[PDB]
Design a protein around this ligand. Structure first.
Ligand code: HEM
Length: 153
């Protein structure tokens, strides 16, 4: 759905994230929890945290942040051929976590906001476009495996 040029702009900015996956991960989560507080409710381990300072101090949030961006970089580096990587993820998010597709949308946004903020020189207009389409592709594939797992997304 993305051209090669677009994969290139995606892998270029991912190279900046690769240096600090956990600190990036922790920042995406705080942005999501602040923007859409309803999403904090899905994480048992730290749904009690009320503020940013508490959030920044949680070792658990960081670790989870880490897991989440690690898995995502892995998908992105496949350039669209990520069936094997997405299967396990659709399976736990549709059964265990029960993450609605609107929630994958909010985190997408959150992702784009952090990149914009940290790496504007590696995230111009075209890159922003490419990243949005790559995340859309990911949500569309997630949604297709959720249907099959009988999870109304
Ligand atoms: C970019 C999209 C996401 C990716 C790539 C991702 C990836 C992961 C991975 C790899 C794990 C660990 C193993 C597993 O449980 O599958 C995980 C855990 C989890 N994810 Fe997702 N995730 C994403 C989005 C979300 C969103 C938006 C939510 C809720 C709003 C969510 C809720 C959870 C929860 C509740 C867990 C269990 C965490 C715990 O151990 O306490 N995820 N995620």
């Amino acid at each position: 759905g993305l051209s090669d040029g677009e994969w290139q702009l995606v892998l270029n900015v991912w190279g900046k994230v690769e240096a600090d996956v956990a600190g990036h991960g922790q920042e995406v989560l705080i942005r999501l929890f602040k923007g859409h507080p309803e999403t904090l409710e899905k994480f048992d381990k730290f749904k009690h945290l009320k503020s940013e300072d508490e959030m920044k101090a949680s070792e658990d949030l960081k670790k989870v942040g880490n897991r989440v961006l690690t898995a995502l970089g892995g998908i992105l580096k496949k350039k669209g051929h990520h069936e094997a990587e997405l299967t396990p993820l659709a399976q736990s998010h549709a059964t265990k976590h029960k993450i609605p597709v609107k929630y994958l949308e909010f985190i997408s946004e959150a992702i784009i906001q952090v990149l914009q903020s940290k790496h504007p020189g590696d995230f111009g207009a075209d890159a922003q476009g490419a990243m949005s389409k790559a995340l859309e592709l990911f949500r569309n594939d997630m949604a297709a495996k959720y249907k099959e797992l009988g999870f109304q997304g």
